[PDB]
């Protein structure tokens, strides 16, 4: 293929002239930023781009500019195209290893100044932190080299090419290559120089090239440790190295964005609290091993660090170069079948975090990454998986300092090889225990393809060698969803040679033939349990443990049943936790035309909005946080189920159990919320518990002092005693009032002092109910009892298909008889309505009796619903009344769960209490769907201006409710597409279907499903 | 439907017309049989239901027509017809094989072939004909992804299954990816030969065609040889269609076909 350049279709051309990967250290004196405006032009394909060996700055000066770093699909007015979203499918034809012939090619150009002294004093390099997909590099019209690996770095020696005065850098960037085949992550396709570019000036005669730091405990009791520091010095003109380790700074250290990101400085004295000092001797190995007496451990719960300074020293005893970094005393092992850190079998409370920003894409400001991690810490997360590639190199000090268990992952995904296979065989489902046989079929294309070995090894080598020295990283991962083949085995051998100190993960390798860990994604409990049992021998020993590298798919309303996963995690030593997918929605900000308004509004794009030929729609929106990286109810729920302290209140006792891996409860203040006075809780070690006699209902565990990025008073855990359903002390007026009953041909009236009740007998509709200045009426379309909800993302693949199939949205009430009698026991009147509630097309439905017992200040509504007929649905979304609220309506207040929404399998984070609608910002989903329900509601007060409250309570069971404004939710593509009525309604529900995680994972669990059955429930409408 | 149920069969082969009465009751008497090649009528014996006759004839095309107004039908109304099968004859077009001086310009992206009354431009990156103007008549490829396309707007019948397959296999998103273009001077009366090697395959998929398009350019004619080799795993069962799409020049007014 001579119409496609050789290097874009050669899997072995991983780079040309790239320097060997070394440990990353930012140094202000060495690093000089080349970020900013660059000359830029885009071409249809390589053959339209100029020859860079002949490109003048005088010519490039005339082009438009683009700012580095940024993606070229994310510019003002979509100047250079729009983002493309695909999940599994490749957006190109599969013709390995050829990219498409029409291959967007972007040429970047800028200049920089070089001194006379500069070229003499320094070795000059260019370092590119990330360029997608690949590029060739030119300096002063001379070819320097080539590079592949979008999320990896690259350094090139530039010394031969530089001149005094102006220097011209030209980068030719290509969108597609043979590399595209191994970069098929479920994310946006975005191109360009999206990470920092730097000019490096290293001391010329000698400099530090690489450093290796390891900490190995000498002993099984993890006290004394050996600190090993090996240095690679390049050049002859040096004497020796010095090394100073400083006194530790406890992991409880207070940070903020400013101090975490501070990059200074040359004259800045790193530290002076010396602990250990070592010097090398002239002509001796520039490495050493030191015994360290009982050092403070580095742990994710307590990220204690020892700062160090490494000095390269010349003959005259002057400092040639310094490295200022840190040591975290930590050892990871596979021990008795568990992932072990300092001897302890840890629990992952994790997420997958992609690089994403709603405006900049994968070009994420560090400021924003810090924001992410502070939020994670604020919500009890202790681990992150770098799905599915290494991040910006500066991010790893953030993990080190804040404390996260980190899975650093190779930039390698091959998923798309399956798509044609899936479609050709009409595959419906993949299961963690069996799906590997399906991937085995196509592994020969890439992961079992010898032509790709060099590329695969490069992804491994680049991954490990850049980030080796970060204590936060405990696991290397070979990539994601790339099938299984010989190349993976090769990667495993190499990584163990390069870095024996860590463990290797790869989920595509079911049996872990070349991994140290087992890993499932989105497994069913039964599937987890099968695996556990088949890998635990008769003695109870297992060789390797199980983690869930992805689980509890956080797409939209959900995920349900995080609780049940957690119970499983705590019960078996074999399970060591999981990482939920995903941290945040990948929404891109854009201008949307409103379906509600006809006008232009800000929205967040998912597949289809940028009009891709092929895309995967709303699967972009699968985070615990929204596109703006703010918490959803998903994150709120996750924080609760993973809380590292259990507080159980029953039988006049509070039981507190420490569920941390390492730290004590000493940092926590326990408050009795009923009294406000604190509770003396003994210092609890991991897994230790205590029972304290108490009359309390509600206990909170809170931070005593600012520590890390958390503030004093920040809630870590809490518990409540279960709250019995109490009938409010409402006094029903049973005194005898004269009442006019008018039973007309169609309408029935009941009028009394302060009361007006009108029912349409033909429809079963309440035309108007006005009691003491407060009015409601039925929100009626076909039926007075309704069943539909705007489908969640989880509802879509199955439950919605069923509910639509059975016409649940078209349920009709057909009145058979209406009975009107005078009041009995204090009653004004009794109106009884007999009907069948059934959808068009169908036999199935409910023989329904609605008995309205009318009192002067209260209306008792008894509902009896008998499920009858053949060919029934399995379940319903919902069941209850819809009422229009009067013009007077202003706000509401409830006793039950809050402050936020709650659903059967997503409710426990929402503690019991008295809540006011005025105190709550109701959550707006990036993709409109079922929202705003409140489950386990004891009572609900609806406030009407100038007329007090209407109290609503269900007899003998808590109920569900939603008060809103909104409709057209099913078909609104974005928040701004949601329509709004001129009045509010109450959705008053006996029961509601759970939420689950079926968009990717298990269906709503049995105990949370709203199964088809008879319904019988009684409500009181009490008017103040 | 009118044709398949015609109540008289007319079969023309081997210098013979065979006429079979396929009515249930009536005779062929009411019918006039015309030899369409000559315009003169054919004497056909009165045929009863299921009776037939073979008549020697050089005819290619025989029509059965109503003699007189009868019922709600008019004299001359066509009831049945037959044709002899028509062999494919190459038109007697004379290709100009005389030696004309021709300028061939093989640029970085575009290839030009210019001669007296001829202009051929191909985009080598796309495999697209930018313009073909010969003797005042211009065409160019109607191009979106590929110079050879496969899609059709689904019929009602296509919808329940065939369309589901064709959409599933992204046949509507078939792409042409050019691998090599070869430009050589004309040989046997030829002005130039431009050969295009490509893979025609849809996004997402392995399957596709290893394609060779050979354009042999003469002064008054362009021979287009297409070779399409089906390659790769996970293929569709069938396609809606296969062929070229060309924009017609502003001059275009009408068409005629045999
Ligand atoms: Mn919209």
Curated annotation (Swiss-Prot), chain A:
The active site is at 481 (proton donor), 550 (nucleophile). Keywords: Glycosidase, Hydrolase. Transmembrane segments: none annotated. InterPro entries: B-gal_small/dom_5, Bact_Beta-galactosidase, Beta-gal/glucu_dom_sf, Gal_mutarotase_sf_dom, Galactose-bd-like_sf, GH-type_carb-bd, Glyco_hydro_2, Glyco_hydro_2_AS. It catalyses: Hydrolysis of terminal non-reducing beta-D-galactose residues in beta-D-galactosides. Its EC number is 3.2.1.23. GO terms for biological process: lactose catabolic process. GO terms for molecular function: beta-galactosidase activity; carbohydrate binding. One of its GO terms (cellular component) is beta-galactosidase complex. The keyword 4Fe-4S does not apply. Belongs to the glycosyl hydrolase 2 family. This is Beta-galactosidase. The gene is LAC4.
């Amino acid at each position: 293929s001579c119409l496609i350049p050789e290097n874009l279709r050669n899997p072995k051309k991983v780079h040309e002239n790239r320097l060997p990967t070394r440990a990353y250290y930012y140094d202000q004196d060495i690093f000089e930023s080349l970020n900013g405006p660059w000359a830029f032009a885009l071409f249809d394909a390589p053959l339209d781009a100029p020859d860079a060996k002949n490109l003048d700055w005088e010519t490039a000066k005339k082009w438009s500019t683009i700012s580095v770093p940024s993606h070229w699909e994310l510019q003002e007015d979509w100047k250079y195209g729009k983002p493309i979203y695909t999940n599994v499918q490749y957006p190109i034809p599969i013709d390995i290893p050829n990219p498409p012939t029409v291959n967007p090619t972007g040429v970047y150009a800028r200049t920089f100044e070089l001194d006379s002294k500069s070229i003499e004093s320094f070795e000059h390099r260019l370092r590119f932190e990330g360029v997608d997909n690949c590029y060739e590099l030119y300096v002063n019209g001379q070819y320097v080299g080539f590079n592949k690996g979008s999320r990896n770095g690259a350094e090139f020696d530039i010394q031969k090419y530089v001149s005094e005065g102006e220097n011209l850098v030209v980068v030719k960037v290509f969108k597609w290559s043979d590399s595209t085949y191994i970069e098929d992550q479920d994310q946006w396709w975005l191109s360009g120089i999206y990470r920092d570019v730097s000019l490096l000036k290293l001391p010329k005669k000698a400099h530090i090239e690489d450093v290796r730091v390891t900490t190995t405990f000498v002993d099984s009791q993890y006290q004394d440790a050996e600190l090993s520091v090996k240095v690679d010095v390049q050049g002859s003109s040096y004497d020796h190295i010095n090394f100073t380790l400083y006194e530790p700074e406890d992991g409880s250290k207070v940070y903020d964005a400013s101090s975490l990101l501070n990059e200074e400085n040359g004259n800045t004295t790193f530290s002076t609290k010396e602990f250990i000092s070592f010097s090398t001797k002239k002509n001796e190995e520039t490495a050493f091993k030191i015994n360290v007496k009982a050092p403070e451990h580095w742990t994710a719960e307590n990220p204690t660090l020892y700062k160090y300074q490494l000095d390269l020293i010349g003959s005259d005893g002057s400092v040639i170069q310094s490295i200022k970094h840190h040591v975290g005393f930590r050892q990871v092992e596979l021990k008795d079948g568990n992932i072990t850190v300092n001897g302890k079998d840890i629990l992952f409370r994790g997420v997958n975090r992609h690089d994403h920003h709603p405006r900049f894409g994968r070009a994420v400001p560090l400021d924003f990454v810090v924001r992410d991690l502070i939020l994670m810490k604020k919500f009890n997360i202790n681990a992150v998986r770098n799905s599915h590639y290494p991040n910006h190199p500066k991010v790893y000090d953030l993990f080190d300092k804040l404390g996260f268990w980190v899975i650093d992952e190779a930039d390698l995904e091959t998923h798309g090889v399956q798509e044609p296979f899936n479609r050709h065989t009409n595959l419906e489902a993949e299961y963690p225990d069996t799906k590997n046989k399906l991937y085995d079929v196509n592994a020969h294309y890439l992961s079992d393809n010898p032509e790709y070995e060099v590329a695969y090894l490069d992804r491994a080598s680049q991954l490990v060698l850049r980030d080796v020295n970060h204590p936060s990283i405990i696991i290397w991962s070979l990539g994601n969803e790339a099938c299984y083949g010989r190349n993976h085995k090769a990667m495993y051998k190499l990584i163990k040679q390069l870095d024996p100190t860590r463990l290797v993960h790869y989920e595509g390798d079911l049996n872990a033939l070349s991994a140290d860990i087992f890993s499932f994604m989105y497994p069913t409990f039964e599937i987890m349990e099968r695996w556990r049992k088949n890998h635990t021998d008769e003695n109870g020993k297992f060789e390797k443990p199980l983690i869930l590298c992805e689980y509890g798919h956080a797409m939209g309303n959900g995920p349900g049943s995080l609780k049940e996963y957690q119970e499983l995690f705590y019960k078996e030593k074999f399970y060591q936790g999981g990482f939920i997918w995903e941290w945040a929605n990948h929404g891109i900000e854009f201008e949307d035309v409103s379906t509600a308004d006809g006008k232009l509004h800000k929205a967040y794009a998912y597949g289809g909005d940028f009009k891709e030929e092929v895309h995967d729609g709303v699967f972009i929106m699968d985070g615990l946080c929204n596109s703006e990286h703010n918490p959803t109810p998903g994150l709120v729920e996750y924080k609760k189920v993973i809380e590292p302290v259990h507080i159980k209140i029953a039988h006049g006792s509070v039981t507190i159990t420490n569920k941390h891996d390492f730290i004590t409860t000493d940092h926590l203040l326990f408050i009795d919320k009923d009294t406000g006075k604190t509770i003396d809780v003994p210092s609890l070690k991991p897994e230790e518990s205590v029972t304290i006699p108490s009359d309390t209902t509600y206990v909170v565990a809170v931070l005593k002092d600012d520590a890390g990025v958390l503030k004093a008073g920040h809630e870590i855990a809490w518990g409540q005693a279960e709250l019995p359903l109490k009938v409010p002390d409402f006094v029903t007026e049973t005194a005898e009032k004269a009442a006019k009953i008018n039973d007309g041909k169609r309408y029935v009236s009941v009028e009394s002092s302060g009361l007006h009740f009108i029912l349409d007998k033909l429809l079963g509709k309440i035309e108007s109910l006005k009691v003491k200045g407060k009015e409601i009426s039925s929100k009626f379309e076909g039926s007075s009892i309704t069943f539909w909800r705007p489908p969640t993302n989880n509802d879509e693949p199955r439950d919605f298909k069923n509910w639509k199939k059975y016409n649940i949205d078209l349920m009709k009430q057909n009145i058979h008889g209406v009975s009107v009698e005078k009041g009995s026991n204090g009653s004004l009147a009794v109106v009884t309505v007999n009907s069948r509630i059934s959808p068009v097309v169908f036999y199935y439905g409910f023989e329904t009796v609605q008995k309205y017992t009318i009192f002067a200040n209260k209306i008792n509504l008894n509902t009896s619903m008998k499920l009858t007929g053949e060919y029934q649905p399995p379940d319903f979304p919902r069941v209850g009344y819809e009422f229009w609220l009067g013009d007077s309506y202003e706000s509401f207040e409830w006793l039950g769960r809050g402050p936020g929404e709650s659903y059967p399998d997503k409710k426990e984070s929402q503690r019991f209490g008295l809540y006011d609608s005025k105190d709550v910002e109701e959550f707006v989903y990036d993709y409109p769907q079922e929202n705003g329900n409140h489950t386990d509601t004891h009572f609900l007060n609806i406030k009407f201006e100038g007329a007090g409250k209407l109290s609503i309570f269900q007899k003998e069971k808590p109920f569900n409710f939603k008060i809103s404004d909104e409709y057209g939710v099913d078909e609104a593509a974005h928040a701004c597409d949601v329509k709004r009525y001129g009045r509010h309604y109450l959705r008053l529900d006996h029961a509601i279907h759970g939420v689950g995680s079926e968009a990717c994972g298990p269906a709503v669990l049995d105990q949370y499903r709203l199964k088809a059955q008879d319904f019988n429930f009684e409500f009181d409408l009490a008017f103040e």
